[PDB]
Amino acid sequence: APQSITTLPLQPDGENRWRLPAGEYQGQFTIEQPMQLRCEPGAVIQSQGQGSSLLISAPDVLVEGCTLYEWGSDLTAMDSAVFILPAAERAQISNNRMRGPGFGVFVDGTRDVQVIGNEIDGDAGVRSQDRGNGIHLFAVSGARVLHNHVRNARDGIYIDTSNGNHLEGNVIEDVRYGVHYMFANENSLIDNVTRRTRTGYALMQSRKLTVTGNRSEQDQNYGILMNYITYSTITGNFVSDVQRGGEGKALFIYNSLFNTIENNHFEKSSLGIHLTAGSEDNRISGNAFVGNQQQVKYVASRTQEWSVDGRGNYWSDYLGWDRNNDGLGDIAYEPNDNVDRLLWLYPQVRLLMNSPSIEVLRWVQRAFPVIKSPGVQDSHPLMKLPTEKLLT
Amino acid sequence: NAVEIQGVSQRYGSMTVLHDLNLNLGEGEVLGLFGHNGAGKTTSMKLILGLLSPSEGQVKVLGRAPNDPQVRRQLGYLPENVTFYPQLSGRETLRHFARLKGAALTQVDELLEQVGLAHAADRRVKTYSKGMRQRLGLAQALLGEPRLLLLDEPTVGLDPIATQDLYLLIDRLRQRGTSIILCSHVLPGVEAHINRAAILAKGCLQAVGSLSQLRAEAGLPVRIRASGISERDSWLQRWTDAGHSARGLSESSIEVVAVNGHKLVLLRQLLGEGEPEDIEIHQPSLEDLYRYYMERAGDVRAQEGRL
Amino acid sequence: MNAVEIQGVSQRYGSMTVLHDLNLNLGEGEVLGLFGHNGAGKTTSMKLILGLLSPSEGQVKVLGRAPNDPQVRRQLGYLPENVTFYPQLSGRETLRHFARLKGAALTQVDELLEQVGLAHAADRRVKTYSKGMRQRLGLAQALLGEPRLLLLDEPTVGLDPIATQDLYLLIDRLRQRGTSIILCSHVLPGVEAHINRAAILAKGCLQAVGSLSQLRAEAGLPVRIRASGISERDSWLQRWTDAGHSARGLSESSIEVVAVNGHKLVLLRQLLGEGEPEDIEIHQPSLEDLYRYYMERAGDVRAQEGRL
Amino acid sequence: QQSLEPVAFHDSDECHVCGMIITDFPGPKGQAVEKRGVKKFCSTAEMLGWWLQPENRLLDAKLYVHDMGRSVWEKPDDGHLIDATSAYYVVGTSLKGAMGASLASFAEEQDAKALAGMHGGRVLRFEEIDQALLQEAASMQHGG
Amino acid sequence: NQVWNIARKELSDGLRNRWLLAISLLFAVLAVGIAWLGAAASSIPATIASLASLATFLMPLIALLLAYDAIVGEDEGGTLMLLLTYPLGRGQILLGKFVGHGLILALAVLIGFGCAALAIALLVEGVELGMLFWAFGRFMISSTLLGWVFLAFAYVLSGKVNEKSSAAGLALGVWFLFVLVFDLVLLALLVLSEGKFNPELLPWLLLLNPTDIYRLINLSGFEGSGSAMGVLSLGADLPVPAAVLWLCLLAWIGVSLLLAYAIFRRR
Amino acid sequence: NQVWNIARKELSDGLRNRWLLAISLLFAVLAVGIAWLGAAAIPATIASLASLATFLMPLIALLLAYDAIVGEDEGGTLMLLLTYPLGRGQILLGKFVGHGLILALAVLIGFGCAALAIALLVEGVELGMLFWAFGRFMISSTLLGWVFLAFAYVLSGKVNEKSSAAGLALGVWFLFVLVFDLVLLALLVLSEGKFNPELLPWLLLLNPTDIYRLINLSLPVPAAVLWLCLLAWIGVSLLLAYAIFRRR
Ligand SMILES: [Cu+2]
Numbered sequence A: 001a002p003q004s005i006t007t008l009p010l011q012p013d014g015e016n017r018w019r020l021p022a023g024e025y026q027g028q029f030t031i032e033q034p035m036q037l038r039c040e041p042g043a044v045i046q047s048q049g050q051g052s053s054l055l056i057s058a059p060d061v062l063v064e065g066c067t068l069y070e071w072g073s074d075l076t077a078m079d080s081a082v083f084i085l086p087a088a089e090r091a092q093i094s095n096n097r098m099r100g101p102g103f104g105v106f107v108d109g110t111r112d113v114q115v116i117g118n119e120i121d122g123d124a125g126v127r128s129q130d131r132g133n134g135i136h137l138f139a140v141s142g143a144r145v146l147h148n149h150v151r152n153a154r155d156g157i158y159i160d161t162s163n164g165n166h167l168e169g170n171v172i173e174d175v176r177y178g179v180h181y182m183f184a185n186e187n188s189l190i191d192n193v194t195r196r197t198r199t200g201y202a203l204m205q206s207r208k209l210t211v212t213g214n215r216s217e218q219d220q221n222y223g224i225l226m227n228y229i230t231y232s233t234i235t236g237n238f239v240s241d242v243q244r245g246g247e248g249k250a251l252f253i254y255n256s257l258f259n260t261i262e263n264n265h266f267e268k269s270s271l272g273i274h275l276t277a278g279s280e281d282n283r284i285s286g287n288a289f290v291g292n293q294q295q296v297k298y299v300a301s302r303t304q305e306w307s308v309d310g311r312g313n314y315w316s317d318y319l320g321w322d323r324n325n326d327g328l329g330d331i332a333y334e335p336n337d338n339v340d341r342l343l344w345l346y347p348q349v350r351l352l353m354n355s356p357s358i359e360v361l362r363w364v365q366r367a368f369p370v371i372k373s374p375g376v377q378d379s380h381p382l383m384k385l386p387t388e389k390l391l392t
Numbered sequence B: 001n002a003v004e005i006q007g008v009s010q011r012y013g014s015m016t017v018l019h020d021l022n023l024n025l026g027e028g029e030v031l032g033l034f035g036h037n038g039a040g041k042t043t044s045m046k047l048i049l050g051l052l053s054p055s056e057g058q059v060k061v062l063g064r065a066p067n068d069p070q071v072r073r074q075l076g077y078l079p080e081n082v083t084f085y086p087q088l089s090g091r092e093t094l095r096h097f098a099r100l101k102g103a104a105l106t107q108v109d110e111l112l113e114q115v116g117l118a119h120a121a122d123r124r125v126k127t128y129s130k131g132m133r134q135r136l137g138l139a140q141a142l143l144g145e146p147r148l149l150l151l152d153e154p155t156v157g158l159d160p161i162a163t164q165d166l167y168l169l170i171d172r173l174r175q176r177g178t179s180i181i182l183c184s185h186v187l188p189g190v191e192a193h194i195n196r197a198a199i200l201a202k203g204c205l206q207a208v209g210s211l212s213q214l215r216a217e218a219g220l221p222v223r224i225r226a227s228g229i230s231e232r233d234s235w236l237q238r239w240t241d242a243g244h245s246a247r248g249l250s251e252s253s254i255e256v257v258a259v260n261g262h263k264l265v266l267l268r269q270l271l272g273e274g275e276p277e278d279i280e281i282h283q284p285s286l287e288d289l290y291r292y293y294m295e296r297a298g299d300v301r302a303q304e305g306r307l
Numbered sequence C: 001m002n003a004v005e006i007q008g009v010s011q012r013y014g015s016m017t018v019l020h021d022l023n024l025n026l027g028e029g030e031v032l033g034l035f036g037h038n039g040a041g042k043t044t045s046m047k048l049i050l051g052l053l054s055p056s057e058g059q060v061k062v063l064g065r066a067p068n069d070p071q072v073r074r075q076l077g078y079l080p081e082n083v084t085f086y087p088q089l090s091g092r093e094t095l096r097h098f099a100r101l102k103g104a105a106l107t108q109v110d111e112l113l114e115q116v117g118l119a120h121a122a123d124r125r126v127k128t129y130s131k132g133m134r135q136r137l138g139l140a141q142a143l144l145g146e147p148r149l150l151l152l153d154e155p156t157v158g159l160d161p162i163a164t165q166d167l168y169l170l171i172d173r174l175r176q177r178g179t180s181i182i183l184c185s186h187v188l189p190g191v192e193a194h195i196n197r198a199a200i201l202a203k204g205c206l207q208a209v210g211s212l213s214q215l216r217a218e219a220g221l222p223v224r225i226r227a228s229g230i231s232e233r234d235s236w237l238q239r240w241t242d243a244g245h246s247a248r249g250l251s252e253s254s255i256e257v258v259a260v261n262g263h264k265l266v267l268l269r270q271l272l273g274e275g276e277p278e279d280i281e282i283h284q285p286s287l288e289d290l291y292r293y294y295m296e297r298a299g300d301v302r303a304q305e306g307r308l
Numbered sequence D: 001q002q003s004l005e006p007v008a009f010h011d012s013d014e015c016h017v018c019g020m021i022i023t024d025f026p027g028p029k030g031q032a033v034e035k036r037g038v039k040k041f042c043s044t045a046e047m048l049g050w051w052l053q054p055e056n057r058l059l060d061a062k063l064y065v066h067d068m069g070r071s072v073w074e075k076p077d078d079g080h081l082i083d084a085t086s087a088y089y090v091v092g093t094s095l096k097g098a099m100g101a102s103l104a105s106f107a108e109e110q111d112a113k114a115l116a117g118m119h120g121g122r123v124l125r126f127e128e129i130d131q132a133l134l135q136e137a138a139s140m141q142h143g144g
Numbered sequence E: 001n002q003v004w005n006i007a008r009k010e011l012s013d014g015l016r017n018r019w020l021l022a023i024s025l026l027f028a029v030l031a032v033g034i035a036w037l038g039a040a041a042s043s044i045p046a047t048i049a050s051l052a053s054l055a056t057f058l059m060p061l062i063a064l065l066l067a068y069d070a071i072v073g074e075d076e077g078g079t080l081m082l083l084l085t086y087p088l089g090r091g092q093i094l095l096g097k098f099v100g101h102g103l104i105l106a107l108a109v110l111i112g113f114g115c116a117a118l119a120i121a122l123l124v125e126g127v128e129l130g131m132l133f134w135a136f137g138r139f140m141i142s143s144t145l146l147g148w149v150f151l152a153f154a155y156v157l158s159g160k161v162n163e164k165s166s167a168a169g170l171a172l173g174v175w176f177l178f179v180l181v182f183d184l185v186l187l188a189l190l191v192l193s194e195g196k197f198n199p200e201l202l203p204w205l206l207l208l209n210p211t212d213i214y215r216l217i218n219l220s221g222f223e224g225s226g227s228a229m230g231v232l233s234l235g236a237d238l239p240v241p242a243a244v245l246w247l248c249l250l251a252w253i254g255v256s257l258l259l260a261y262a263i264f265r266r267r
Numbered sequence F: 001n002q003v004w005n006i007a008r009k010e011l012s013d014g015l016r017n018r019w020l021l022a023i024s025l026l027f028a029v030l031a032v033g034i035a036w037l038g039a040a041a042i043p044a045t046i047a048s049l050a051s052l053a054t055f056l057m058p059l060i061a062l063l064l065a066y067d068a069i070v071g072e073d074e075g076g077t078l079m080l081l082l083t084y085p086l087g088r089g090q091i092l093l094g095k096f097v098g099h100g101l102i103l104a105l106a107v108l109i110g111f112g113c114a115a116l117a118i119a120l121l122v123e124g125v126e127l128g129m130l131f132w133a134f135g136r137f138m139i140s141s142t143l144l145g146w147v148f149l150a151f152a153y154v155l156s157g158k159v160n161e162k163s164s165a166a167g168l169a170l171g172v173w174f175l176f177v178l179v180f181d182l183v184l185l186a187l188l189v190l191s192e193g194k195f196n197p198e199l200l201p202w203l204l205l206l207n208p209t210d211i212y213r214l215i216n217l218s219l220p221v222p223a224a225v226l227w228l229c230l231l232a233w234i235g236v237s238l239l240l241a242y243a244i245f246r247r248r
């Protein structure tokens, strides 16, 4: 494992600032001194396929404009492209191109690391179980990962036990998970774009975090998966066309107790929102459930009001009126019948689902409200689209 | 004088379906009304019952107005076809009409035995034949001593023992002083029981009077046939001396169409020479008299087999 | 040659025999009348002639064949009572339907609509037909083709008295051609002028069969002679009563004699020799009175003064 | 009789709920044999969160968890895999499970009593597990 | 009186109708079944709006099953022309049929809501017997009036037609229009216009349907939720008090009986 | 052949039924109004059309033929027709041909205007699949109607009055459309999975309305058995109707 000083860097400025010229290199490299090294666009630092290509151990290093290629793939020894030690505090990794079968940016124990503007194309042939993470973050406080471009890695931007950090404006394409969260208390992520992913947003056991403005374009089987998230905030997310591959759920809420789910847009999926029985009584108001073949799946008999402060959600199949000209509807909207939960409770009713007796039983509930099980209704639903800005 | 129709010319739709019939009916007579082309048969039927208003003329039933309630308790109307109330029983149907007409309820048990229906009393009218409903329809017509029956074909769907017994019940009520009107289209058989016929056609009442008068006011041949004559060759000619064509169709079936002006000398021909077996003075019946008065007003004789 | 040869049938339903030992022979051109009261024999005999039932202890030979051959039923008209056809069909289309089934030519439909007098009410629905208007339609399907046997079960119910007498005028034109028909009626005056031979039958059996001259000769029934002023009622009331005949003492100027019509050959000679015959009416004992005699003769008791 | 066989875990075995790789985690891993198709779980608390849903109360399926009284806690072998209804789960320990609260499953109740006093937890049966307890125990583990 | 002597027939003829006794026992076994499901779910404003919906489907059905062949079933049966030759009027053989068929509906709903109350006082423990008697007393004297509306509707379509097979077609048309077409025409007028067709005229269209005036009477005190009502949420915008809603239910009888009498007077 | 001469009557008499033409117009209106609200708002709308034609094609079949045998016995023409050169088989089979081509025309105005409302209001429907999915739809809707036609001949031959035939034809329509599947649903909720899963698909073969939906939703059985089980509901119940009609 050689060092960065073993190359030929031409200094532009004598304040530990270096500039590597155009031309390829070979092998792993190590930064041990606080060097704000830049690179020409022809600086293809291509390792031979083993080891972490650019290991970083010194604080305050502004690595910029490098192009790394073909590092190792041993995920147990964490063969990354940019390994950042716990002593390498406040590192800037700006505008880099990476192509190799392991971790793109592996940091651990770091503070105030900035991973900005990189393009990390992961793999093509590995089975998405050994491709390595795009931007792996392991218990970092202060990080700023902004406007990257991760493609074809394994589980995108993995985050493990990292407390305070922002994920702003990065595009994540053709991965298993878009953004993975594990025990990340008081986190934040803004305006990320996830495309063609087997789960758009994994929210596992991370409390008190802000999920805002994110987009999920044509993901597979899970739009935003939230497991055990408490005191969170889901405001302004655009989840569109979650096709099957699960049957396709734009939001799957599993054991999330308290969180504010407002102003979202769940569009053209098979299930608009799946609410499990353990995750109840959280503020869900102002979303747009348009184009989904089934809006809410709620297999319970407990009532669940879905409108805080008298304002509810926009539903596309809401066949209601508005006499006094406010934004709210006049009749309440129950998204589920009693026969719409017999199909979920007993799957053999799928053979009887086109029968006239089921079409009779849908009308008997609208005429005789004693047989209506208490569902997932919202008093005062919206009449117009509240997310007029999220379609752009 | 039960039914006194005078000057009545019923118009509806400016069609004038009845015109100037003056039909006075006596207090013991049995009148018969027979209608073909003319609608008079039904309009006049209504007119006496009071459920129609006589335009340009007055109808006086039983000396009073035809729609008064005091005379409408004294009428009896057997309509054409009355399937009454199929879920009610026989007694409960007749007790219903006894309560409406004001008759005493003790008459119901002695009218379901007077008419032959006590075996089918307390049985539902849906389990009745057409003859049993005509028996029940008569039972409400005799309800509470009616002084004017008005029967519209009472013997349809009825077995011939009850038909003969119905006219014996009519002949009991004629002697009691109750005028009966037998409006029928079953003209053979009713001519033995009525007193005066009234053939009305195209609205205008063509002929009225007794059966002896309708043969006098209409020259019709009397059909004397003497079945079982001794000699037949001179009996082809011996009646034609005074203009009676002795036409025969069998070994001895000489149906001699006479003229009703030489009835002494043909029977002196019959009884002076030749022995009879069963003489049959066959008068021109009510079927034959009806087609004379009908043809005299508007009707033309139909062809060889063409009705 | 005989059209209907009912040869000793005995039709039973369960243990009860509803028609026992019926023995008919309808001729080649005769008009026979099946009259029944208590018995269901009349209805069953009608069914046996048709192909509707089977003789449980006999045989029937309709037109020299079995009654259920297709060659028989193409030459067998049958008008049933109280028939009401398909009311949304028209009057012409109903006969055009029935002409296709019997194999009759379709050029006979417009003849028979004209023949029964239904030319004005053809191409109108059967729901807007009267009762007698449907009897003209029901008669017209019986005349389809060239039938050799007609079973007119109550043909003149609800029919006009011109059309009733015209119908029997069509019968005597038909029986001259050789079509032996059968009347089934309950109105006994009216059929009696055209019935060739009555077939009055009781509960089970067949009581009497034969012509009207044979029924009046066998059943001794008194003649109903009514007169009006030959010489005097009271001078003529005495003469038939010593000779054993009933002279009814009516009100005024009317001589009603109920004589026993066996001695009346020489008894009428004195009536001619002392007065004019200018208003008399000798009535033979009618078919209504003959049928009332045969019911009383077997298993019946006369109803009261005026009861039924 | 196809529900009688607890199948072994593979490396390419995703959880039924969270969907991530099961064998990259410590702790006992429950699974549910359905006799029409086997579905597996990354933690026992994620299996018990799935079991208490009303789609699966009526579902005739055998539940199988690991026996941590006969296994090392970081890498449990497929091996001995007891029935989950007759187990003795300890709760509230500081051990790091995969998804939910740490519910170490045992079969002998004394080794379950060993880990309860060794970490400050309370042994409890399968029927005492409810959704008021799973959300309470995970908040005491991954909170504050 | 002659009006009672002809009411005694129809009281004893409708009770032998086996099609009546089937669907009036169906009204009894459903009003117990609704009140049992309203007792096991303990709720109160849902078992009132569902019982009033049960009598919306059945009390027009029992009324039109009785009286669709009241006039034309006697006219083609021959017994109407006979009845006018009795000492009667056309006003007595109509008001007598209304009294006779009206006491059947007064008994078919006293059985139905009577056994529904005994499936509440014997099922939910501690219910207010004063509030139970008042709510089910308002159900009894208003489901007769809904029944007497469709009784008087059936006399209109019996005097107008001249064939009983066509009276059953019109009685099926009246049952479909007033029960579950006017509730859907008003819904589709509100859905396609999004409540901006007329913000003040549309609550007055509830008074043009006696099944909707019936639902507005019984859902007065127990309003409860909004989605259980449906298009009856327009009834909160009706400025008429509760006493006028009784009077518009009685006016639906008296206009459609005077129309039924004026049609029958020129039969 | 006299099976056709009596079939031409039932076409001319059935097409003038005012009760039928009201329902067949309402079938064609509701098939357009479902197709209008299923395209602007094709397997998603052919399932809602299958639930529509399960309501009305039993109702159209029972409106035609509830008074086929007992309506002619009350009319008196049944006793007249047997004295013609006609068997009891040719009356029944000729009524079945005549009433069969009526509701074989009622789906050509029903779905002929529904497929017109799909081929002209989707603009990109891929019509090569349309003329095969509606060809399987119009054929299977006639065969559903031909079962209940043969059910109507069974109840017509058994009763003796026209009023009790409509009381049984309403009972057959309630039992075979919306009581047989409600007692399927009822057993499942009480059982709480006690009822065998495999047993329920086979039990749909005892219901011709259920076999109708299974050949419009394409399952342990293949497709070709359900076509031969729907035709077996015709052939058994017509043979049952002929056995009842020979015992009058
Ligand atoms: Cu995870």
Ligand SMILES: [Mg+2]
Pocket: A321, A322, A323, A324, A326, A327, A328, A329, A330
């Ligand atoms: Mg509003």
Ligand SMILES: [Zn+2]
Pocket: D015, D016, D017, D018, D019, D020, D041, D042, D043, D046, D099
């Ligand atoms: Zn898991």
